[PDB]
Design a protein around this ligand. Structure first.
Ligand SMILES: [Cl-]
Ligand SMILES: [Cl-]
Ligand SMILES: [Cl-]
Ligand SMILES: [Cl-]
Ligand SMILES: [Fe+3]
Ligand SMILES: [Fe+3]
Ligand SMILES: [Fe+3]
Ligand SMILES: [Fe+3]
Ligand SMILES: [Fe+3]
Ligand SMILES: [Fe+3]
Ligand SMILES: [Fe+3]
Ligand SMILES: [Fe+3]
Lengths: 178, 178, 178, 178
């Protein structure tokens, strides 16, 4: 029985480029987390309490996703390498603009997973593609959700009355098409 | 004991023109169903989740109505003839325009029943008029309901804020005058 | 942030051939639905009430599958295109022959998914393969189930007594090997 | 306030031909009742206990229908005239033949109602057509049910094994397509 790079018994070696890609992706999830925290603060600063609560939860969830990936590296007997985290964007001119950055951040998180997926397929790493499959499934739902929130906010067309209504929807937990 | 056209024991023969009218009406109900599906999709594409949920349910209900008619033909020992279904309308310029098509579709479904009813009366088919009576009753309620939804949407006069409020009413199941 | 063809924010563009393949597949599911409705009617016409109830449920389930696909196109910000639906087959010489068409219809539904799957893989659309994976899983179970029902009916070898026994199994919900 | 023929206050006079038709129809229901009793006995004599229980219940139900009509005449302030009841048919060569007489008896009961209905319409007696409407509705269900039982028995093609299976269905209360 061989030892993997993190010292645990090794079920199958992992290509170093794939390892690097996963470690990088963990940073993407952590960065999405602190981005959503920054968005939650921006909303709180403007009394958009429902949007604040929503993004506060998204920040915690994105962190959980990151930890989920660190557990996979542990399971694969690979080393983690927690990286420097950039500061998030913190200023937007409107809620519509914030929600556009949010949607983009969610789509970019999926693209990151997609590139890890493609690398695993090139390396015939079926453990990794299997591991990623439900995460892609969840990304589809999150993209659908953020397209919903963005589109609803854009429909409001900057009217504070409509934005207050949507804010109250979010506070109530009405955050998807259902 | 004689056999009816579908092979079952025949309680009373049905006029072929009336049979044809019922088979055609089944197509009308199936077409209303796929129309409401198309409307549900249009609403989902614009984040009008309450309207989406409403029309999703209406589509399933209209299909149930169609099946209800197929069961009557079985009960009358008559053949069904499930027909080619046209593609639904799928594009509208506004929710008000969609709701107008919806109201028209509901009124046209009733007119179809009315013409079957008149044919049955001409043929003294009391089983059929009795069978249709509660369906007309339900059509009155549906017409009242769709007049309510259409009128409420028109009252909104295209204001997104009012349309979001109505959308939330529909998501909550508030779909009639009550 | 770009807009997709259905107007929603676009997380990732979809190849038009893949879009066409999915829209076509939706028609396959809708056609399986109305086929199972026709089969339910054929069974009802011959007093095979358990088979009638079974196929009535299968028709509703196949429709749900179709709607499930329309929701995916919405989630991908792609347009739906609900198509003309052909009339189903409606005449069979025996229950064994009906069950053979049913099994074939189920296998053909899977083949349709398989061809969409292969197109998505050619286009590296991992959202779509992930979306399809559980549907293939369900198809395996449905194929196993329909092979069971077909084989059991063939074992009966046209004996009405055995077919009445199987009919009662189906009415009771005994529809799989378990 | 005028008195009706049975001595009660009269809300609206009834045409004597319509009265006679209703009194005659009551006899039809009473005759169906004793016919089903005779059928229940025939089945009991051949150990077809499920068919016996079914027809025993049908006999009681048909009597209830007759009494329901006597209550309508009372409500209309009209006299009842309970008539001589013919002896029922009591001999059949097979269960299939009995079930054919049963189906015919049910269809003939509906025809009787239909002729009363037509007379009421000729006389513009809307109370009577309204009164008859749910009874026609129930007749449709009974015709569907008896077509089911007859067809299932004919499918058995005289095989005692299949007839024992159907007998047990009836004992269990499985008497319709459902
Ligand atoms: Cl805004
Ligand atoms: Cl509008
Ligand atoms: Cl067969
Ligand atoms: Cl027999
Ligand atoms: Fe994430
Ligand atoms: Fe995310
Ligand atoms: Fe309808
Ligand atoms: Fe309708
Ligand atoms: Fe399906
Ligand atoms: Fe299927
Ligand atoms: Fe009766
Ligand atoms: Fe009866």
């Amino acid at each position: 029985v061989a030892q993997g790079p993190n010292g645990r018994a090794l079920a199958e070696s992992m290509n170093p480029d794939l390892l690097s890609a996963i470690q990088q992706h963990i940073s993407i999830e952590r960065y999405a987390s602190v981005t959503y925290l920054a968005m939650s603060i921006w909303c709180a600063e403007r009394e958009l309490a429902g949007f604040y609560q929503f993004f506060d939860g998204e920040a915690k969830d994105e962190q959980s996703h990151a930890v989920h990936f660190t557990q996979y590296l542990i399971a694969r007997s690979q080393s983690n390498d927690l990286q420097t985290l950039d500061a998030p964007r913190q200023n937007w001119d409107s809620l519509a603009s914030l929600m556009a950055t949010a949607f983009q951040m969610e789509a970019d998180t999926t693209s990151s997973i997609q590139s890890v997926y493609a690398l695993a397929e090139r390396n015939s790493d079926t453990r990794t593609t299997v591991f990623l499959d439900p995460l892609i499934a969840a990304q589809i739902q999150s993209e659908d959700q953020f397209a919903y929130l963005l589109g609803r906010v854009k429909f409001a067309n900057g009217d504070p009355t409509a934005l207050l209504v949507i804010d109250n929807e979010l506070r109530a937990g009405q955050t998807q098409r259902g």
